[PDB]
Amino acid sequence: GLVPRGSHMMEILRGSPALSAFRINKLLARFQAANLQVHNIYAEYVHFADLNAPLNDSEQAQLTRLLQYGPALSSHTPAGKLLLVTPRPGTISPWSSKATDIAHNCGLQQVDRLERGVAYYIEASTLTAEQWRQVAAELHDRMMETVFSSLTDAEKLFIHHQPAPVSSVDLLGEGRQALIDANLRLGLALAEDEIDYLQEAFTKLGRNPNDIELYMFAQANSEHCRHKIFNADWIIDGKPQPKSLFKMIKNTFETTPDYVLSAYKDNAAVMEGSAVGRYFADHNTGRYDFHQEPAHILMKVETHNHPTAISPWPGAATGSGGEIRDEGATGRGAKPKAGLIGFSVSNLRIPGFEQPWEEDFGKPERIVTALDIMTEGPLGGAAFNNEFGRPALTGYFRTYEEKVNSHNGEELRGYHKPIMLAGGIGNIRADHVQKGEIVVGAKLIVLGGPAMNIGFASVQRDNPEMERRCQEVIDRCWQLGDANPILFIHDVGAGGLSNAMPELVSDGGRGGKFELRDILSDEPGMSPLEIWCNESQERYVLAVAADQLPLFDELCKRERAPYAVIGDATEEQHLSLHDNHFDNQPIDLPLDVLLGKTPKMTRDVQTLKAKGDALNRADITIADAVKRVLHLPTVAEKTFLVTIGDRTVTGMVARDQMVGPWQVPVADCAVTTASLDSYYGEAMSIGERAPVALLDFAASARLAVGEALTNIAATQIGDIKRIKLSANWMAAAGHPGEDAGLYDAVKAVGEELCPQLGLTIPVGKDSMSMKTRWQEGNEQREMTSPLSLVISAFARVEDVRHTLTPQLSTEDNALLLIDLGKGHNALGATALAQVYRQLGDKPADVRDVAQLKGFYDAMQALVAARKLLAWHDRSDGGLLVTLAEMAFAGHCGVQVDIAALGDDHLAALFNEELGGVIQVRAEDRDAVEALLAQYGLADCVHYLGQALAGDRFVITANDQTVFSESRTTLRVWWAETTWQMQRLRDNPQCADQEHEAKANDTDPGLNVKLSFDINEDIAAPYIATGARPKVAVLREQGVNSHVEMAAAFHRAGFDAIDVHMSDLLGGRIGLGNFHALVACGGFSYGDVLGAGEGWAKSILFNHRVRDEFETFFHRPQTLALGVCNGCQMMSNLRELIPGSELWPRFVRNHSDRFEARFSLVEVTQSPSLLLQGMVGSQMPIAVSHGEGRVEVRDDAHLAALESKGLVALRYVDNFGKVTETYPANPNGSPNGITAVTTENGRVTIMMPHPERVFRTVANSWHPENWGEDSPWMRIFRNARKQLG
Ligand SMILES: Nc1ncnc2c1ncn2[C@@H]1O[C@H](COP(=O)(O)OP(=O)(O)O)[C@@H](O)[C@H]1O
């Protein structure tokens, strides 16, 4: 289908079936839900290749071949009305970018841009003209897509628009009315005092302000960027206040500057880490080596709220993405390590799962429902974390939408405008913590992908791989130690370049002259205002010395990370933006003019305090209360938000959400090791309790600090001063009583609580318009969020191994409760109250500062002395939930008595006061109690009872049964939410299977069977000779699992070398000098055009390199391992590998969702050399993949594979049998297949990640007697011995 397009040719190539069986059954059942009689529906992908030059015969074949991918589903001949859905015209989907890279990397330079769409074929002869428009709607997201009626209509996507000129606003010729008009038109949202500034400014200059200059100024001065509320003066109840919000927060740093390396001086904070071995490839040798040096820790937590309300997936994706840029741009370069996610929404109201407290209060048309946010949002954030390569180890998810009697009387409080939170931690070198000086004449560079028109405008666009490439460049720079060319690096986020650049030069006491036409752009038609102010993603601005340019270029190219020099640093503090096309100057301004601050903001507010009504307990019984509480999304299991995101990448994850043999998501905090050779590390926890604000502001804030602390309490940290905090404030500024409450809240923690505990707040952010106004019926309605503080705690871990979890032990034990509520048992603004549609009287609060510090100090002591068996703090759901979740984690029973907890049983069980339950060895009870008394906690400590093998959850009181149920029953109820979420989001069959497996109490959980000695380093004799064979650690743009892959081969005695595909395509390296090659995991090219396919075809199409691989595979004694993406890549290299004729393809999972699981596999009999002596073994392994399902060409191909004896690994359930049941088998591979070898066994490919779990500490769960090495370390040692 080759049709012209003015200057280029627009080729139309037909793709494979786009929708799976269950997906189609869903669409049809959804059509009838609107009375649309549709006989049958058939979707099919269609590719559109806008190419410049002609495509030769052999090249046309290679193109078609690039475009044949994905699951081999049922293919039908088109029939019915056609509806082509494609990205909206003038927009370039991320798919287009990655797919076009591949085309280029395959030598198809003629391809100007590849783009995809989905051709729907609907048979429904009954539908009217109007009913059709209704159908087209169900088939596309109006925010980013459009529907066509012809495959020809796709030409409208590659149109060449003429470069738009800069527009001037005639102030000199029309007066102030010119700025008034533009402010409205361009939508600048400038306050009267700002228009005055602009008027005087340009009057003094004597010229007209360009639109680009006005927008740039407007963006720099918005609330989001200026934070006027946080720096404003205050008058509360007719009384002037001495400090601003910011100043009060800075107070925590003044009283406690301990361990802080940087704060409020970067877009991230830095704290002291631990001296450990930083592992990376040397610049000169290309070999990975351990560098003994301090690995300081940086942190940051951001919010991408508003965007998420309009378009969830991209809104969440870019929220995490922009935050990753802030970490990477810390100082002169830093490396992101682990992530965290936060979500706050209104009631889910899941169809057919309506909860007792849920009421429909309507919502604005312009935004999406609570459910859609939780359906697409998490996938969006996880998408960026997965494709980029940083584990998502902790987070929170809370629902709240209720008409309640609060500070401003009866109102609708909730989250129609959601809280989308993303943050993380990272490592940074000591000498890079401080930003260097910007020398005059320094080249100003933009690192990242070509800009597009973004910022309806709230619909973002993420290209995670692009950022992965950029990060690799930043990594090469800081690894150059002193030679690090990066002088000053800054991230590009809000305000696009118009903000980022003026900020970079300004922070360096310089100015900058730029060239608009030096900026990389994907769409020519942009105006100077659009090229300079657009908010496209994956961009960094940095400064590099003139003489270091050749090096920076050498680095960017090797990583395929696009960059561009767009300006020069100048002496005079003056911003200049020249345009070469029109030969004019869009920007010409003195920096103090553009950055000139308007008068200080001053808020005169008054206090509002909610009356608060007693809890009406008419329909409240302890039994129904338990059932209700476990069904509140805030309390319920979060598996739908956890398994969708990677949790093992980097091989440094010690403690993830999933806990124990039964992998229950109840881990209170996250923990990572500082490196691949140390037991030190970092920790992350989250404290949040927003509902409490609807009654008391300071209390809610205090509780956030408290919970964060109690959630991290069971980790070996030491001095509390090591725990650094991040404070994120979500509020509805202007709303009655929120301003006085926010000040009171910020003060409560900034001036009082945090300084008293010795806790610093080096980072923070704000989002001040957390409200939503609309008209559902005939009148005005409003959904106001409560003041919402989200505290993120961070700390250097002393010993990663001593971290405690909620996994109970059935051995002789003692369940002790640390009740920090001091008997208060408050029920106000709790989960119990929410579950019965109420707010209640009085909420919880930090009752005694000294005891909270004492609590933490005591916990630190018990953790160091190894006197604790388990720990779980009390938060949402109360003591009931803490105990329930512990039982869930230990897969056992609980026998507790609550008579000493006060006469009010409901209160003792459902109050959300700080504290928790510790489990100690029975013989250790008295000593632990005495210790707990030493910190003055005796009155708060109460012996609850003990953990017992079984299925009974029994709560008594002096001699009466207060509550008793099947532990499995509570567990299954507690799961219903994630079950329902997975049913509507994933393959119903999978979600169901996973849910039903939890009802089977006989589940033994993950267990081990070892056919060999886990501690016998069989490679030691070899390593001892000093002779170290080199292994080619092969990566491609997008690979993110290469470092831990090299560290694994390193421990086995190899000298791992960093071999990038560019290195091969450039002749810098040759496989001839290697006896071993390993293809690493990740998301090469963002898995576009089939996971692993672009990477593989990149080799196959370049005959020189192709032969390099074939020659390697055809040698007599060479080894080759392929993990994950590598497994997928190599499976497409069958023609190059001898004895791989029977290998299968790896495609989309049956669940149709990314699976990051700790799955149990068994080592089967095969010629495989890397699995020597492991046959028969059964151990769990890291699984992070979305296209790992084995697929054969027909049953004959599968029988043939089985009879040839090529299967190396199979998934097995916890009972030991090979299973195709989910999630024990995460992808749905036939006969549990996830590893296959060749006839000679010299080549082995597999989906699981053995290299991520070679260290016992990197295993989510493992037997208590394992030493340093896990069973999987054997794979690597086997490779060394085999080489000799
Ligand atoms: N949005 C989220 N994303 C990822 N993990 C999450 C999210 N919300 C909760 N989790 C994880 O689920 C587990 C339980 O969450 P939650 O019940 O909120 O914990 P807690 O009770 O300690 O506050 C934790 O391990 C937590 O990190």
Ligand SMILES: [Mg+2]
């Ligand atoms: Mg909880």
Ligand SMILES: [Mg+2]
């Ligand atoms: Mg907790």
Ligand SMILES: [Mg+2]
């Ligand atoms: Mg929490």
